[PDB]
mmCIF file of C-alpha atoms and ligand atoms in Angstrom:
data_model
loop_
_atom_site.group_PDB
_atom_site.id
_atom_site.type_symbol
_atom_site.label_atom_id
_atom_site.label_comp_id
_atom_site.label_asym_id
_atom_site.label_seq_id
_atom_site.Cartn_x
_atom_site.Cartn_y
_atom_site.Cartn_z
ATOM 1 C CA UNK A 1 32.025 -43.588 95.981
ATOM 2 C CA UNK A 2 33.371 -42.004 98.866
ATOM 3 C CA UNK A 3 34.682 -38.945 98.796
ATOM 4 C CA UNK A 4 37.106 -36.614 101.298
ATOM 5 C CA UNK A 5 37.092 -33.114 101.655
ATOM 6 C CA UNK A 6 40.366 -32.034 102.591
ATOM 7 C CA UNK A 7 41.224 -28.000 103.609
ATOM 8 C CA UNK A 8 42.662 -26.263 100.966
ATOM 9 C CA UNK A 9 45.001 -23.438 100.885
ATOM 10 C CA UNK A 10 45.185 -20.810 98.701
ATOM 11 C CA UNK A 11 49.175 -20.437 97.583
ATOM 12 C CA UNK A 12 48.560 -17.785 94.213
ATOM 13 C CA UNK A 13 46.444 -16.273 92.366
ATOM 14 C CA UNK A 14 46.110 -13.918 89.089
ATOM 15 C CA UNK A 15 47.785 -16.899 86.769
ATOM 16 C CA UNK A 16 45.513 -17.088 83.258
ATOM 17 C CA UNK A 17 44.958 -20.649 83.139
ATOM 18 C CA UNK A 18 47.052 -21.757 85.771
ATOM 19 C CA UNK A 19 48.505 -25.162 84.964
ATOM 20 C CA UNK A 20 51.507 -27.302 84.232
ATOM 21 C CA UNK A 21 52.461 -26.887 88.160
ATOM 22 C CA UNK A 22 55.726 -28.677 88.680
ATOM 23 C CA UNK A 23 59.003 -29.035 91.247
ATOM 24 C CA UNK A 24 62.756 -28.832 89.871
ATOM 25 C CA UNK A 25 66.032 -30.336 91.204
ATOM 26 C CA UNK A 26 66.554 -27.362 93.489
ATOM 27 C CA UNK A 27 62.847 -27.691 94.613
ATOM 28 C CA UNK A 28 61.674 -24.209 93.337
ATOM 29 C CA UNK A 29 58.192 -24.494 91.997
ATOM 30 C CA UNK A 30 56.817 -23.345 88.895
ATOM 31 C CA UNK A 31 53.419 -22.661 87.163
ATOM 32 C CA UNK A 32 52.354 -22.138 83.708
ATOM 33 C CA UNK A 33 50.083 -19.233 82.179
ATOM 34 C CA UNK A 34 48.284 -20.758 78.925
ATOM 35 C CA UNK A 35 45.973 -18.142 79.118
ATOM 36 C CA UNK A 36 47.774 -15.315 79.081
ATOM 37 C CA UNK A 37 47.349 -12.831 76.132
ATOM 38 C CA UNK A 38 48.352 -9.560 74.665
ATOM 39 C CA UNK A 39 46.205 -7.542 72.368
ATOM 40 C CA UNK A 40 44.032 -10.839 71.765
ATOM 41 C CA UNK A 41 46.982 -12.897 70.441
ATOM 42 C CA UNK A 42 48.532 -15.930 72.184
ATOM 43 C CA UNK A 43 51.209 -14.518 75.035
ATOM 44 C CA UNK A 44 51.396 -17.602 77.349
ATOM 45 C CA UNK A 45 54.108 -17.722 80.531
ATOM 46 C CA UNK A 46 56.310 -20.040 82.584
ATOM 47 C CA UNK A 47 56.271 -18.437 86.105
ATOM 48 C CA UNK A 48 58.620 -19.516 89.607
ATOM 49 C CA UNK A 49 56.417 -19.224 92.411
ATOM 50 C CA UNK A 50 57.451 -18.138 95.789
ATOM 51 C CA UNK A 51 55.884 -20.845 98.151
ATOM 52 C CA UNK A 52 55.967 -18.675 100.827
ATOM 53 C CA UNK A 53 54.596 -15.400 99.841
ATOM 54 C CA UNK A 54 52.866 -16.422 96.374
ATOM 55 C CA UNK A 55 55.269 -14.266 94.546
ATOM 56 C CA UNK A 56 55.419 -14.670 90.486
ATOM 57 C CA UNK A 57 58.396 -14.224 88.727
ATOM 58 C CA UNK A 58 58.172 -14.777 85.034
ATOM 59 C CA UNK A 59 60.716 -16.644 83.655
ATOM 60 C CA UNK A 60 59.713 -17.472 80.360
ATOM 61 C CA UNK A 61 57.487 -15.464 77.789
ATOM 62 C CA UNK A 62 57.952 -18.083 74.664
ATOM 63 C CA UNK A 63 57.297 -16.642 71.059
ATOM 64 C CA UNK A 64 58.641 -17.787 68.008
ATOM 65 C CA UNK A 65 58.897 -16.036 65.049
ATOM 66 C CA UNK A 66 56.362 -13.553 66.128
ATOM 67 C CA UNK A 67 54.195 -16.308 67.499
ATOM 68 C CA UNK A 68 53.482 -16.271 71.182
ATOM 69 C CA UNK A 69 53.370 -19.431 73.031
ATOM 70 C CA UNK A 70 50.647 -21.008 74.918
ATOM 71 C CA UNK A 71 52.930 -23.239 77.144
ATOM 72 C CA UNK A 72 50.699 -25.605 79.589
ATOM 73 C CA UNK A 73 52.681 -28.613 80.332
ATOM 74 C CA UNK A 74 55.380 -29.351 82.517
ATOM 75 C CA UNK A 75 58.230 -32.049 83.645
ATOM 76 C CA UNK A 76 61.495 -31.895 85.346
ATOM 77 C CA UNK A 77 64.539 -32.819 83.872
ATOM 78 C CA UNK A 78 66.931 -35.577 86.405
ATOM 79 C CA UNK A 79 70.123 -34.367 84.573
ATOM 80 C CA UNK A 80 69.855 -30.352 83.925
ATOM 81 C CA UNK A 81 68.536 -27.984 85.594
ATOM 82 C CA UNK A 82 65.602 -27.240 81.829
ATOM 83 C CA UNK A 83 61.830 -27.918 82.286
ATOM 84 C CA UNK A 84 60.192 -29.677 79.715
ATOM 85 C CA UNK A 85 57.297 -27.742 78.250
ATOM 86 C CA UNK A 86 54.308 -28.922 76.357
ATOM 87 C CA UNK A 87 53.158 -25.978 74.689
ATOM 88 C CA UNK A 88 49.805 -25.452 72.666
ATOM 89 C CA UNK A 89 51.089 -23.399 69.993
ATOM 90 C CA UNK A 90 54.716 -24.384 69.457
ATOM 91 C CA UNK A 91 55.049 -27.552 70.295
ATOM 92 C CA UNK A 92 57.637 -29.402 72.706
ATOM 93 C CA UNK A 93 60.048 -26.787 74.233
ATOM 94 C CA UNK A 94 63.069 -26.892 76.681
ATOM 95 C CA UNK A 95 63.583 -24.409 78.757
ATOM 96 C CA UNK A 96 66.157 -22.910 81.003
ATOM 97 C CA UNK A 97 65.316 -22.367 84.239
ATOM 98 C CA UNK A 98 67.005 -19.054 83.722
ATOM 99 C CA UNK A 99 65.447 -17.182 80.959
ATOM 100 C CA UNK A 100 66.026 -19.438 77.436
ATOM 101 C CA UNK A 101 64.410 -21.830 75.499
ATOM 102 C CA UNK A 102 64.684 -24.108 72.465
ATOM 103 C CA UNK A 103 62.217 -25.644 70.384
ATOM 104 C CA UNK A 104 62.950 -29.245 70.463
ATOM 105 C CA UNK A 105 61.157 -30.118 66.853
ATOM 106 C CA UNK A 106 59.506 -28.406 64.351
ATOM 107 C CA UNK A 107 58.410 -31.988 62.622
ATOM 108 C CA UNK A 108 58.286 -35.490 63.928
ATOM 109 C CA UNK A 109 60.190 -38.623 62.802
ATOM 110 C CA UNK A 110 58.587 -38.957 59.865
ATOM 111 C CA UNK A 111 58.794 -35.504 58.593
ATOM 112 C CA UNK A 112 55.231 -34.195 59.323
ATOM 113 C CA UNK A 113 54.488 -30.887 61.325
ATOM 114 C CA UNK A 114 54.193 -31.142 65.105
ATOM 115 C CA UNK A 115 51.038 -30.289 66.573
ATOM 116 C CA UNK A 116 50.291 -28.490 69.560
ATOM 117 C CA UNK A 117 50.741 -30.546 72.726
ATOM 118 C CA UNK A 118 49.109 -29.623 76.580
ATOM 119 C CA UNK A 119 51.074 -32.282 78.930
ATOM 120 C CA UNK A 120 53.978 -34.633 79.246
ATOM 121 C CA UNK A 121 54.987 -37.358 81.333
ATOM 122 C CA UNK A 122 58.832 -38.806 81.674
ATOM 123 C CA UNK A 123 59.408 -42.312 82.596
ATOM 124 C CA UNK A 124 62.039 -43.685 84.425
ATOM 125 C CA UNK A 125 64.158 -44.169 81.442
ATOM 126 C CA UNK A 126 64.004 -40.549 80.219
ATOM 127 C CA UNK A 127 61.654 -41.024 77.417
ATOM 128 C CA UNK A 128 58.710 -38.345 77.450
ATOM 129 C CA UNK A 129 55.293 -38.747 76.613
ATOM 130 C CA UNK A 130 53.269 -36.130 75.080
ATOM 131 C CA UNK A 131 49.845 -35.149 74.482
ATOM 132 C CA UNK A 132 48.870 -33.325 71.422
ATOM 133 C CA UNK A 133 45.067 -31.970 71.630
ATOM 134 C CA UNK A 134 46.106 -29.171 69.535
ATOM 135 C CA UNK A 135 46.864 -28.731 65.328
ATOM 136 C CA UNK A 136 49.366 -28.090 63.973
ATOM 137 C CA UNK A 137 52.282 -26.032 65.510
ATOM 138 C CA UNK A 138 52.332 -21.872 64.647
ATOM 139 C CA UNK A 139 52.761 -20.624 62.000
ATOM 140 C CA UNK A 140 49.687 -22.637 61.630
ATOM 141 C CA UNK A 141 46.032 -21.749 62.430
ATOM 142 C CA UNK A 142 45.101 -22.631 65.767
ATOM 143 C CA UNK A 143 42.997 -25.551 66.241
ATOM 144 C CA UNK A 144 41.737 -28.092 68.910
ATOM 145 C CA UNK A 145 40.039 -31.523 69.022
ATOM 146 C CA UNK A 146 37.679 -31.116 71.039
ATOM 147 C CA UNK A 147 34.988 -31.989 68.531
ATOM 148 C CA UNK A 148 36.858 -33.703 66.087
ATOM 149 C CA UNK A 149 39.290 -37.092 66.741
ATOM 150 C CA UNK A 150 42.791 -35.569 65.301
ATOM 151 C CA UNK A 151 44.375 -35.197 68.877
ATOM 152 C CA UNK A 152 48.350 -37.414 69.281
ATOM 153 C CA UNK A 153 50.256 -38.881 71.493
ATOM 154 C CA UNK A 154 54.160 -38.422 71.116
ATOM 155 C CA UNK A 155 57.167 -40.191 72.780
ATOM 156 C CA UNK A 156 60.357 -38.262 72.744
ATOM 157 C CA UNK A 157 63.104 -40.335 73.559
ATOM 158 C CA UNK A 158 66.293 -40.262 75.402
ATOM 159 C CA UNK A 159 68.044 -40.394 71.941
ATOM 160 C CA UNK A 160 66.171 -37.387 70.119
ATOM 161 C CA UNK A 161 63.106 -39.030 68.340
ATOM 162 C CA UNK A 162 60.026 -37.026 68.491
ATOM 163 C CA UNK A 163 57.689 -40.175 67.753
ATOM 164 C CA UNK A 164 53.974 -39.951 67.016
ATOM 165 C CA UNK A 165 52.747 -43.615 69.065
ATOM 166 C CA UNK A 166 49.188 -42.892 68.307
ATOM 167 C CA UNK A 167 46.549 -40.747 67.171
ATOM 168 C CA UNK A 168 43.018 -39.788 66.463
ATOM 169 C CA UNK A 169 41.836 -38.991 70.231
ATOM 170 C CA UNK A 170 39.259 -36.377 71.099
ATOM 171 C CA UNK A 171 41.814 -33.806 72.950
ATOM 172 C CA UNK A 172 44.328 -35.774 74.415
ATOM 173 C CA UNK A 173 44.669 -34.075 77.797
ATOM 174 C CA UNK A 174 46.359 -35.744 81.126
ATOM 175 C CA UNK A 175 49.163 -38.692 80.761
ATOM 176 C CA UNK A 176 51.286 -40.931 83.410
ATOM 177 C CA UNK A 177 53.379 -43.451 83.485
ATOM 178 C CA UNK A 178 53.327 -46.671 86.149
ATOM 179 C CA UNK A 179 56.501 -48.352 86.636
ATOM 180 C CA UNK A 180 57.220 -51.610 88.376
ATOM 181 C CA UNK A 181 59.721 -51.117 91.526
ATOM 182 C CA UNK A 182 62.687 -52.075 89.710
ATOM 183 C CA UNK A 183 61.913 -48.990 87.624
ATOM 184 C CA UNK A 184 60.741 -50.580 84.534
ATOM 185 C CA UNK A 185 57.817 -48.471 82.592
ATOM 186 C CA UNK A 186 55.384 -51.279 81.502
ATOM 187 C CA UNK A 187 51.598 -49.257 81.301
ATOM 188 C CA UNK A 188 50.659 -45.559 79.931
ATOM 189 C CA UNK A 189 47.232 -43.411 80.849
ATOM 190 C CA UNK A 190 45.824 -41.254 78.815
ATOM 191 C CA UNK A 191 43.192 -38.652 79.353
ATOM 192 C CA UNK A 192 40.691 -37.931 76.352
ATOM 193 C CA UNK A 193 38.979 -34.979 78.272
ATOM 194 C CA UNK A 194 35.827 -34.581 76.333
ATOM 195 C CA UNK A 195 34.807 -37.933 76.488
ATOM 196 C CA UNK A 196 35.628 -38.685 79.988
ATOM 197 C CA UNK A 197 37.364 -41.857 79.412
ATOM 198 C CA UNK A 198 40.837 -42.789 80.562
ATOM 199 C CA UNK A 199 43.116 -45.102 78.252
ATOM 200 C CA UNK A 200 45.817 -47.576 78.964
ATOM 201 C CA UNK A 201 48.595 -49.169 76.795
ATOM 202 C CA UNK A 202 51.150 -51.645 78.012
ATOM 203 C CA UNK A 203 54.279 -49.958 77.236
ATOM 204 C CA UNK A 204 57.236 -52.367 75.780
ATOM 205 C CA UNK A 205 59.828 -50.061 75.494
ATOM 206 C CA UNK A 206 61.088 -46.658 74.133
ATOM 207 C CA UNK A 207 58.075 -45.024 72.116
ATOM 208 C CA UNK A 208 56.904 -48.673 71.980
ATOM 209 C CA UNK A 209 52.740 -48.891 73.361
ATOM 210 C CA UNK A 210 50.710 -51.924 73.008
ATOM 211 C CA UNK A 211 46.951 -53.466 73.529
ATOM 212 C CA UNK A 212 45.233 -49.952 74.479
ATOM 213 C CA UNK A 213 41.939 -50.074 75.504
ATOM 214 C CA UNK A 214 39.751 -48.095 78.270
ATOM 215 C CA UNK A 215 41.312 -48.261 81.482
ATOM 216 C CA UNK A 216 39.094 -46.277 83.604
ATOM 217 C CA UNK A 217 35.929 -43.981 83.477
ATOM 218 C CA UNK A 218 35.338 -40.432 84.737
ATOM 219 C CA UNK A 219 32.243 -38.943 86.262
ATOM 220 C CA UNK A 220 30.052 -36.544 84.960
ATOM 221 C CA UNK A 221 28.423 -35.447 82.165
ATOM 222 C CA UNK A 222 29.787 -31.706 82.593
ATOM 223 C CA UNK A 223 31.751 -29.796 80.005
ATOM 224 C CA UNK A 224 34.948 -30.991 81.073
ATOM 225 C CA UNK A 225 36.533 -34.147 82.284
ATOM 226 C CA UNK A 226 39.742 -35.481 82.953
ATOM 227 C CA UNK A 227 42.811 -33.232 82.626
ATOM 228 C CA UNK A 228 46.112 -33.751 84.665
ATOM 229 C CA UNK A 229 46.876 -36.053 86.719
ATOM 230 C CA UNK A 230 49.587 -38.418 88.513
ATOM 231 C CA UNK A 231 50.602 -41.464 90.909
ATOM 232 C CA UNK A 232 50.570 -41.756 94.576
ATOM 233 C CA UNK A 233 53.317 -43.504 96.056
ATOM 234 C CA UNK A 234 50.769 -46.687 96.250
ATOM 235 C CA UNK A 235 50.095 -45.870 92.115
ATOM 236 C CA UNK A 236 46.803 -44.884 93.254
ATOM 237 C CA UNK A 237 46.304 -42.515 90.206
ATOM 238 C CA UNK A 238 44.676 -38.736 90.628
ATOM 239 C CA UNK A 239 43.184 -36.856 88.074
ATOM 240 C CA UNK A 240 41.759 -33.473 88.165
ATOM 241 C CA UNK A 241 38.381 -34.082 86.837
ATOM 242 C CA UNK A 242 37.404 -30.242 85.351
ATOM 243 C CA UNK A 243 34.180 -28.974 85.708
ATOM 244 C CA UNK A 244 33.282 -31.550 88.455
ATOM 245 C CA UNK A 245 34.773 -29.560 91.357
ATOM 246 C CA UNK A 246 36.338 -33.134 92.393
ATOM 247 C CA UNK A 247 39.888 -34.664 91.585
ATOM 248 C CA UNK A 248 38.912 -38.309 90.945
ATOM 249 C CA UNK A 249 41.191 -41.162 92.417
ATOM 250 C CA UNK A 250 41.734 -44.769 90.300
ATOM 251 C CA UNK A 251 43.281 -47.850 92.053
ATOM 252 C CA UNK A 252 45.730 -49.569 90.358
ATOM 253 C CA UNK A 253 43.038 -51.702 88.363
ATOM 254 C CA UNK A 254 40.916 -48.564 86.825
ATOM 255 C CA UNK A 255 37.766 -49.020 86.120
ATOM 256 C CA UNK A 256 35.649 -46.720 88.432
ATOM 257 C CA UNK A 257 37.501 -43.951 90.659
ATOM 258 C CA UNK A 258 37.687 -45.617 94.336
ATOM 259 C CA UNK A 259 37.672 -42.551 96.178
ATOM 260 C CA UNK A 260 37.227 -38.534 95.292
ATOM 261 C CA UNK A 261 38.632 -35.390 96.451
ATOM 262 C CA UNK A 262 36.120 -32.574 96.616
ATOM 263 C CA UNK A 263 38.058 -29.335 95.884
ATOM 264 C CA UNK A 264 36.557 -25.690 96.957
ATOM 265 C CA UNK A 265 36.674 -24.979 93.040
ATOM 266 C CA UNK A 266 34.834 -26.634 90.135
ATOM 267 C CA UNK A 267 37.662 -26.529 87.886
ATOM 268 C CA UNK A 268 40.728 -28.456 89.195
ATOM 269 C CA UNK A 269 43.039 -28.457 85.844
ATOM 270 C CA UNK A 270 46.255 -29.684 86.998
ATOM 271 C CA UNK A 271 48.529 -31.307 90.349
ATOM 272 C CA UNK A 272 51.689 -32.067 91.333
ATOM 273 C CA UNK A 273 53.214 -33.437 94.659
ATOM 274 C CA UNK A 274 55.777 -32.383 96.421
ATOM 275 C CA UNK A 275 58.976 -34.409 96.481
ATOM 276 C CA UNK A 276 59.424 -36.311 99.748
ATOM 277 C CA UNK A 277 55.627 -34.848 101.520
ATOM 278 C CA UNK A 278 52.055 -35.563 100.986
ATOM 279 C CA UNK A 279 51.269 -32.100 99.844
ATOM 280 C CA UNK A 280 49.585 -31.364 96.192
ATOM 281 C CA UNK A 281 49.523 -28.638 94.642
ATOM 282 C CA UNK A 282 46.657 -27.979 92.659
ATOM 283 C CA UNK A 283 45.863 -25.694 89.282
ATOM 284 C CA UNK A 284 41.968 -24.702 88.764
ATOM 285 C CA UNK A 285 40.575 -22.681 86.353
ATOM 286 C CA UNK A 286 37.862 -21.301 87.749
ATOM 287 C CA UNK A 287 39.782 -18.378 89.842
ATOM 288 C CA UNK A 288 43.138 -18.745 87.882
ATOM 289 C CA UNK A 289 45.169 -19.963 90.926
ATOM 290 C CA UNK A 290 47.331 -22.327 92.896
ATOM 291 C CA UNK A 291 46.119 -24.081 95.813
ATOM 292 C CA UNK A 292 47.450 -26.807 98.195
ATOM 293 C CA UNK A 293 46.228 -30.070 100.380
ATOM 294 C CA UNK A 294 47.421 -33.095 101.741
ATOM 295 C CA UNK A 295 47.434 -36.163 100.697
ATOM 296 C CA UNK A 296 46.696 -39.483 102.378
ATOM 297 C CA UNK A 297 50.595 -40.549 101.521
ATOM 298 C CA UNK A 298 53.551 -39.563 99.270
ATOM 299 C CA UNK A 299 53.386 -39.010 95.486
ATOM 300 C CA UNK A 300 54.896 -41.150 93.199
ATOM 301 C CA UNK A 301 58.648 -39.955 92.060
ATOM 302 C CA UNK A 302 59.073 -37.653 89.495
ATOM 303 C CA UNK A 303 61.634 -38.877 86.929
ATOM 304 C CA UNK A 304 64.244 -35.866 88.494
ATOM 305 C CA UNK A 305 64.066 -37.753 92.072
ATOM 306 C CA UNK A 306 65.165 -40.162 90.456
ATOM 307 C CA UNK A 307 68.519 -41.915 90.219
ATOM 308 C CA UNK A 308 70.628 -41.515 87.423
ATOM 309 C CA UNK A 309 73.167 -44.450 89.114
ATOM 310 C CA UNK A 310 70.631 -46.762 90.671
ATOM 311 C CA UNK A 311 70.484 -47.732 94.226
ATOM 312 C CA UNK A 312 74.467 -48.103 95.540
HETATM 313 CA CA1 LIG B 401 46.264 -30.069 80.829
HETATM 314 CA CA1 LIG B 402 51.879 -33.155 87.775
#
């Protein structure tokens, strides 16, 4: 399989399990801090990076009801200026991009406790899919499925349904969407980390997922496997493959990755492009940092480059 080995640059440091990297309207860039505690209890953050000097501003220390938040997830929202946080702890939360948050659902559509989720992916229509890796939401003891198959996937739609698709994965971890030009979401990916398989549903509609089965395969035997990822403009598909020091790269078809990305870290745990450039920006776990590379093209469109009107 070959493999490239692009030069990296180091863009921040010092964030406790940097992930969730992600790009607003207004193009400022943000990070999250799962990682970070206080006196041994959960104390996660949402940070704005400074792309120029590294700087961290926190914007967002999440606790509710004298839980702490372990946010690690992030999307962009086309119409607000809110990030969409999966968050280990408390569940799915909206926040501000100036200091606020809400907790979008304590239970799902049918009444049961949300668990925990660790990424999210918006489609072109506005509907959001989660992972869920984690238990059940704080107050709740903290647990993860690592071991065991209790892990969910979640659609939020555009008209306030927190919908549980499917279950019973072994830590649900990375998820994307691939569209068809005229914007139409027709197939989902989803990462099971642990057992470093990739899985694919057709997708029909809102919270609507079909015919899953094992889309592609990750390499490595490693404690690890795949984590985020996302499209290229081609809907070549790149996922940070943890543990392997590589960030694996599918063709459209799955299967086996046709290409790798050898990163100057072992743990790559999250990416994101930026809007309108071939640059990635890449979360690893191994130093707690940010770092940066190009890209043989474009990434695919975030749902917030999106537009609202269509094409005039
Ligand atoms: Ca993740
Ligand atoms: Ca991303």
């Amino acid at each position: 399989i070959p493999v490239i080995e692009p030069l990296f640059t180091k863009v921040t440091e010092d964030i406790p399990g940097a992930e969730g990297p992600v790009f607003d309207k207004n193009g400022d860039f943000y990070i999250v801090a799962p990682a970070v505690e206080v006196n041994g209890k959960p104390a996660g953050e949402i940070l704005r990076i400074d792309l120029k000097t590294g700087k961290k501003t926190v914007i967002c220390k999440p606790e509710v009801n004298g839980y702490g938040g372990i946010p690690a997830g992030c999307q962009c929202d086309r119409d607000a200026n809110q990030l969409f946080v999966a968050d280990m702890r408390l569940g799915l939360l909206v926040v501000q991009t100036d200091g606020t948050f809400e907790e979008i659902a304590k239970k799902d559509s049918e009444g049961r406790r949300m668990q925990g989720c660790n990424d999210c992916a918006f489609d072109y229509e506005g509907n959001l899919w989660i992972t869920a890796p984690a238990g059940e939401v704080a107050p709740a003891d903290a647990t993860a499925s690592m071991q065991e198959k209790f892990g969910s996937i979640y659609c939020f739609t555009t008209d306030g349904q927190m919908i549980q698709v499917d279950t019973a994965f072994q830590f649900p971890n990375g998820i994307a969407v691939r569209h068809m030009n005229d914007g139409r979401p027709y197939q989902l990916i989803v990462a099971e980390m642990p057992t470093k398989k990739l899985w694919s549903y057709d997708i029909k509609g809102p919270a609507k997922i079909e015919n899953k089965k094992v889309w592609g395969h990750i390499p490595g035997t490693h404690e690890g496997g795949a984590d985020g990822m996302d499209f290229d403009e081609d809907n070549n598909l790149l996922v940070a493959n943890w543990g392997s020091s590589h960030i694996e790269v599918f063709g459209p078809d799955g299967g086996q990755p046709k290409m790798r990305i050898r990163c100057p870290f072992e743990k790559p745990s999250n990416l994101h492009f930026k809007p309108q450039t071939k640059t990635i920006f890449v979360t690893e776990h191994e130093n707690n940092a940010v770092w940066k590379f190009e890209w043989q093209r474009n990434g695919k469109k975030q749902y917030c480059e999106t537009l609202k009107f269509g094409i005039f």
